[PDB]
């Protein structure tokens, strides 16, 4: 009786037909999903736990960072888009929460130059149909989960993790009880 609702997870009352597998939101702005990334390397260590064809998608949410939050959603989505997410996602969580150095759109832009994006190839995709289109598809299942909080996970658009209800004493104990939740979800 280890796994149940309302302790390592709990149950959305309007499951998201059609929603992606595995699920994961973020935002730059957000302390702890500066550590998901760095330190615990959360997405890298469900990945792992997970079955071969079983896919992990990522987002990005508006709601935090006022006016910066908008842009770096439609960052991310360029960033979906190259295919780039592993060369700009630590510069562009150092440059919001540590250096402080991105204040505008202009400042994001400028790290993926500096990450090797042409600045022409970024400000083209910025303005494509394909980054309009992916900037509402992160809006729009935020919405269909009714997301009021980052870092989020979902699988399978009818299950919520809840890492409150893990240990949290020990990183590397709470990434391996994270991990096997969502494998745990996926085969349910
Ligand atoms: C070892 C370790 C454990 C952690 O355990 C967590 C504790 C809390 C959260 C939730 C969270 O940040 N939020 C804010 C937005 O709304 C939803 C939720 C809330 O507070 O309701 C997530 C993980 C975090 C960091 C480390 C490290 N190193």
């Known amino acids: 009786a280890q796994y149940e609702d309302g302790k390592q997870y709990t149950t959305l009352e309007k499951p998201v037909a059609g929603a992606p597998q595995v699920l994961e939101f973020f935002s730059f702005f957000c302390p702890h999903c500066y550590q998901f ?3 615990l390397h959360i997405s890298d260590n469900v990945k792992k736990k997970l079955p071969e064809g079983v896919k992990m998608t990522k987002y990005h949410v508006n709601f935090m960072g006022g006016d910066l939050g908008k842009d770096l959603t439609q960052a991310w989505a360029v960033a979906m888009a190259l295919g780039v997410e592993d060369k700009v996602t630590v510069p562009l969580f150092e440059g919001v929460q540590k250096t402080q150095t991105i204040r505008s759109a202009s400042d994001i832009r400028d790290v993926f130059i500096n990450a090797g994006i042409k600045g022409e190839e970024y400000d083209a995709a910025w303005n494509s149909f394909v980054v309009k289109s992916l900037v509402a598809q992160q809006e729009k299942a935020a919405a269909d ?4 909080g980052v870092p989020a996970m979902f699988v399978n658009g009818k299950y919520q993790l809840n890492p409150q209800g893990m240990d949290t004493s020990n990183m590397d104990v709470f990434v391996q009880q994270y991990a096997d939740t969502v494998k745990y ?3 349910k």
């Open 37 to 39: 990334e760095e330190v």
């Open 145 to 148: 989960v009714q997301l009021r």
């Open 185 to 187: 979800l996926s085969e």
